[PDB]
Every structure is written in structure tokens, then in C-alpha cells.
Amino acid sequence: FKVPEEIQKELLDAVAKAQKIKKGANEVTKAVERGIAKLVIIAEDVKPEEVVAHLPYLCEEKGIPYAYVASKQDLGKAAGLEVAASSVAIINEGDAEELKVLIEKVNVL
Amino acid sequence: AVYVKFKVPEEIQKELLDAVAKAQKIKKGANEVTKAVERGIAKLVIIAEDVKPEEVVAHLPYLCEEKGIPYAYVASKQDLGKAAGLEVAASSVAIINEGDAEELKVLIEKVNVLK
Amino acid sequence: VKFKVPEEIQKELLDAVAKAQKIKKGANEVTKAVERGIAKLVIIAEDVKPEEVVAHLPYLCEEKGIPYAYVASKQDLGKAAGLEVAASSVAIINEGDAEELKVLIEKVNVLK
RNA sequence: CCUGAUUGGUGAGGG
RNA sequence: CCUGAUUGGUGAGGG
RNA sequence: CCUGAUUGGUGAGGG
Ligand SMILES: [Ca+2]
Ligand SMILES: [Ca+2]
Ligand SMILES: [Ca+2]
Ligand SMILES: [Ca+2]
Ligand SMILES: [Ca+2]
Ligand SMILES: [Ca+2]
Ligand SMILES: [Ca+2]
Ligand SMILES: [Ca+2]
Ligand SMILES: [Ca+2]
Ligand SMILES: [Ca+2]
Ligand SMILES: [K+]
Structure with a gap:
């Protein structure tokens, strides 16, 4: 689905202030498989998209x-x-x- | 580490370190710990989670x-040594x-449950 | 006391104790050590009363x-x-x- | 050789 | 061999 | 009860 720039900015801001996070497909996938992930942010310009195509499911x-x-470059900086x-x-x-x-605002979409 | 068979809550880890500090007689170090277990005199063995090469203590759980x-x-061998x-x-x-x-x-009972 | 030991040699006995890496202190621990055969040298104070406490050691x-x-003294031996x-x-x-x-051990074995 | 505690019961010293 | 950062957690280094 | 370290690995504390 598509997220509004207003929310994306909030998502990026959320990652920046987080106390602890996981960066990278390998660690993110593990965080989800272990259930320690509260929120997962995914970049839209990942090529090949296959790298993160499994995350939503x-x-x-x-x-x-x-x-x-929108940006994996922006997500990395955050x-x-x-x-x-x-x-x-x-x-x-x-x-x-x-x-x-x-999270609620996202669940809406 | 593969030798860590189960998760021990931080609160209980604190109790384990406390037990070491209050113990009347202990053995510290892989050689003395192994000798104690083989001699059958160990009542409780505490293993640090950050030992590398893991092979140094990997035999202990088994x-x-x-x-x-x-x-x-x-969690910490440094903390365990201090205790x-x-x-x-x-x-x-x-x-x-x-x-x-x-x-x-x-x-020991609390540990057997986590086990 | 089965034999007399020169003050000079008694000093060496006390120093051997102070320099030792592992010792047993007290009648029970000393006796347990001898029984287990891990004692290399036993030092006995001469002023123990009742003497019965350490009378068994020489034998x-x-x-x-x-x-x-x-x-000579249990006080000095304890300090050492x-x-x-x-x-x-x-x-x-x-x-x-x-x-x-x-x-x-040689010096002592000749004094006996 | 230089560095200088970044090492360490993951086994020193002694027997 | 040349170019020289155009590459990059899309997984370096370590165990 | 008083004395108050005159006691003490001549075996405390713990298991
Ligand atoms: Ca250090
Ligand atoms: Ca240091
Ligand atoms: Ca050695
Ligand atoms: Ca670049
Ligand atoms: Ca660059
Ligand atoms: Ca690639
Ligand atoms: Ca006194
Ligand atoms: Ca006193
Ligand atoms: Ca008595
Ligand atoms: Ca007792
Ligand atoms: K490393």
C-alpha cells in the first residue's frame, strides 16, 4: 500500500529516536521471526525488490x-x-x- | 552461542551472581570447573554467555x-569473574x-523451570 | 617432643610455612592431610596444652x-x-x- | 626493534 | 593490468 | 545476672 509523505516522515523520525533497532534484511527478518520487532519499516526503492519481498507476508x-x-538511502540515514x-x-x-x-495510522491503510 | 541451552532472565542472572559471591567454596575457571564436575563435587555450574572461542566451555552443558x-x-564473563x-x-x-x-x-528450582 | 630442634632450624621451619603455596592449619586439617598422604612436612608446636591434642602426630x-x-610456640606457628x-x-x-x-627436611631428619 | 595494557582463571606463580 | 569510489546493512569484520 | 577479651585453627561460619 501507499503511505503519505507526512506519515513517512513520522516513520523515519520514529526510527531516529528509537532506543534499539535492527538494520538490514538479515537482522530485520530475524527480529520478526523472533517476534521482538514492534514495527518494521521497508524501503520502496529496493532493487532487486526480491530482497524484501518476503517481509510483508x-x-x-x-x-x-x-x-x-520512499528512500532506502533515507531509511539508512534515519x-x-x-x-x-x-x-x-x-x-x-x-x-x-x-x-x-x-502504528494505528498505518494499520488504517 | 550454541552452548547456551536456554534464556535466563536478567533478574535471575543477578541471583546467580549473588549466589557465587555468597558461596563458601567455589572453583573458578574452565579447568577447575571441569575438574569439579568430573569429581562430582559441583552443586551448580554458572557459564558466561560471551566466551569465545565457544569451545572453551561448550562441553560444560553436556x-x-x-x-x-x-x-x-x-551474560558477562567479566561480571562472573567479579562475582x-x-x-x-x-x-x-x-x-x-x-x-x-x-x-x-x-x-536451582527456578533454573530447572527455565530449562 | 621426640627430639629437640635448634632455634635456627625452628626459624627455617617457620619461614618454610610462611613461604608455602598451600598449607593446612589446625590439628584436624593436619591430621586429615597426613591420613590422605598429601602432607610433605608436619610442624608441631611444643607448648600445646592439653598435649593430647597433637600427641598422635609424631606416631x-x-x-x-x-x-x-x-x-617452640603455637603463637609463632599460627602467625607463620x-x-x-x-x-x-x-x-x-x-x-x-x-x-x-x-x-x-634433611637437616631435621638428622636431628632425629 | 617499535607500541605500551588494547591482553587477561581462555590458567599466572609454585609443586 | 587500467580506471579510481561510479560500489555500498542488497551484510564488512569477527567467532 | 556480673565481669568484659583474661578466650582463641585446642575448630568459627557454612554444607
Ligand atoms: Ca581491561
Ligand atoms: Ca588493564
Ligand atoms: Ca601452569
Ligand atoms: Ca555514494
Ligand atoms: Ca563514496
Ligand atoms: Ca548484489
Ligand atoms: Ca590474646
Ligand atoms: Ca583479644
Ligand atoms: Ca577445649
Ligand atoms: Ca563445626
Ligand atoms: K569484532
């Missing part, structure tokens, strides 16, 4: 929230990296309240 | 299981004589 | 072939063993210097 199966952001990130998983939010809200 | 000796884990009264790390510790029988029995 | 060591000697109190007897399990022990 896995999250729903594990009952974990997930949304998309994760504290100097390089891109195809996906990120928030393990410990920065502001519990905001997260619960952000 | 050995204890064979001897019917209780074992558990703590054992050292200024350095310890990959493992064996409690030979606990400080209080009842406390040990309760702790 | 036990002889029966085990373990070297033993005496020192690292205690703040007296010790009726001490057993050296692991000395600090092999050569020295062998030399001391």
Missing part, C-alpha cells in the same frame, strides 16, 4: 506492524548509517505513545 | 547434563559449598 | 613416612601460617621452593 503472519518509505538500508525494525521505541499512534 | 548437575548462565572475587573474567564457576542451602535450592 | 607421621619437626591466633600444628602441602624444603 512474514510480518502479517507474526502479527507485526509494517509500513514503507537508522544512523552512512549507507542505505532496505529495511529496519524498531525494537525499543523512543516514545511509546507516539509509536502506538503511528 | 557434561553437567550427564552428571545430573544443575547449570545456568550469566567470583577476581579482578578479571571467568568463563565459568562451580559452586561447591553454597552460602545458604535454602537459597540455593530455590535458585 | 602418625612415622607410620606414613612423613617428615615432622617442632617449634598467616593467622592472628595460635595453631597447634601445620602441614605443608605445597612448599614455595622444592630445593629448600628438601634441604630443610
Whole structure:
């Protein structure tokens, strides 16, 4: 589905303030398989898309929230990296309240 | 690490380190711990989770299981060494004589549940 | 006291104790060590009262072939063993210097 | 050779 | 061999 | 009860 730029900015902001996160397809997938992932953010410009094509299905199966952001380069920066990130998983939010809200807004779509 | 057979909550890890600190007689280090388990005098074996190469302590869980000796884990070898009264790390510790029988029995039971 | 030990040699006995890597302090631990055959040298204080507490040691060591000697005071022996109190007897399990022990055991074995 | 505790019961010293 | 960062958690290094 | 370290690995504490 498509997420509004307003929300994406909030998603990127959410990753930036998070206390603990996982960066990278391998670690994100593990975080979801272990169920320690609270929210999963996925980049829309991942090529080949096959790298993250399995995430949406896995999250729903594990009952974990997930949304998309336009830039993997932007997602990586929000994760504290100097390089891109195809996906990120928030393990410990920065502001519990905001997260619960952000998650609800996403679940709407 | 593959040698860590089960997850021990941080609160219980604290209890394990406390047990080591209050113990009347312990063995510290892989060689003395292994000798104690083989001699059958260990009552509880505590293994650090961050030992590398893992091969140094990987035999302990299996050995204890064979001897019917209780074992558990703590996250840091540095913390375990400190609890054992050292200024350095310890990959493992064996409690030979606990400080209080009842406390040990309760702790061992809590571990057997996590097991 | 089966034999007399020169003050100079008693000093060496006390120093051997202080330098040892592993010792047993006290009648029960000394006796257990001799019985288990891990004691290399037993030192007995001469002013133990009742003397019955350590009376068995000379015979036990002889029966085990373990070297033993005496020192004037239990207070000094205890201090040498690292205690703040007296010790009726001490057993050296692991000395600090092999050569020295062998030399001391010799000096004592000739005094007997 | 230089570095200098970044090492360490993952086994020192002694027997 | 040349180019020289155009590559990149899309998994380096380590165990 | 008083004395108050005169006691003490000549075996405390723990298992
Ligand atoms: Ca250090
Ligand atoms: Ca240091
Ligand atoms: Ca050695
Ligand atoms: Ca670039
Ligand atoms: Ca670049
Ligand atoms: Ca590729
Ligand atoms: Ca006194
Ligand atoms: Ca006193
Ligand atoms: Ca008495
Ligand atoms: Ca007792
Ligand atoms: K590393």
C-alpha cells in the first residue's frame, strides 16, 4: 500500500529516536521471526525488490506492524548509517505513545 | 552461542551472581570447573554467555547434563569473574559449598523451570 | 617432643610455612592431610596444652613416612601460617621452593 | 626493534 | 593490468 | 545476672 509523505516522515523520525533497532534484511527478518520487532519499516526503492519481498507476508503472519518509505538511502540515514538500508525494525521505541499512534495510522491503510 | 541451552532472565542472572559471591567454596575457571564436575563435587555450574572461542566451555552443558548437575548462565564473563572475587573474567564457576542451602535450592528450582 | 630442634632450624621451619603455596592449619586439617598422604612436612608446636591434642602426630607421621619437626610456640606457628591466633600444628602441602624444603627436611631428619 | 595494557582463571606463580 | 569510489546493512569484520 | 577479651585453627561460619 501507499503511505503519505507526512506519515513517512513520522516513520523515519520514529526510527531516529528509537532506543534499539535492527538494520538490514538479515537482522530485520530475524527480529520478526523472533517476534521482538514492534514495527518494521521497508524501503520502496529496493532493487532487486526480491530482497524484501518476503517481509510483508512474514510480518502479517507474526502479527507485526509494517509500513514503507520512499528512500532506502533515507531509511539508512534515519537508522544512523552512512549507507542505505532496505529495511529496519524498531525494537525499543523512543516514545511509546507516539509509536502506538503511528502504528494505528498505518494499520488504517 | 550454541552452548547456551536456554534464556535466563536478567533478574535471575543477578541471583546467580549473588549466589557465587555468597558461596563458601567455589572453583573458578574452565579447568577447575571441569575438574569439579568430573569429581562430582559441583552443586551448580554458572557459564558466561560471551566466551569465545565457544569451545572453551561448550562441553560444560553436556557434561553437567550427564552428571545430573544443575547449570545456568550469566551474560558477562567479566561480571562472573567479579562475582567470583577476581579482578578479571571467568568463563565459568562451580559452586561447591553454597552460602545458604535454602537459597540455593530455590535458585536451582527456578533454573530447572527455565530449562 | 621426640627430639629437640635448634632455634635456627625452628626459624627455617617457620619461614618454610610462611613461604608455602598451600598449607593446612589446625590439628584436624593436619591430621586429615597426613591420613590422605598429601602432607610433605608436619610442624608441631611444643607448648600445646592439653598435649593430647597433637600427641598422635609424631606416631602418625612415622607410620606414613612423613617428615615432622617442632617449634617452640603455637603463637609463632599460627602467625607463620598467616593467622592472628595460635595453631597447634601445620602441614605443608605445597612448599614455595622444592630445593629448600628438601634441604630443610634433611637437616631435621638428622636431628632425629 | 617499535607500541605500551588494547591482553587477561581462555590458567599466572609454585609443586 | 587500467580506471579510481561510479560500489555500498542488497551484510564488512569477527567467532 | 556480673565481669568484659583474661578466650582463641585446642575448630568459627557454612554444607
Ligand atoms: Ca581491561
Ligand atoms: Ca588493564
Ligand atoms: Ca601452569
Ligand atoms: Ca555514494
Ligand atoms: Ca563514496
Ligand atoms: Ca548484489
Ligand atoms: Ca590474646
Ligand atoms: Ca583479644
Ligand atoms: Ca577445649
Ligand atoms: Ca563445626
Ligand atoms: K569484532
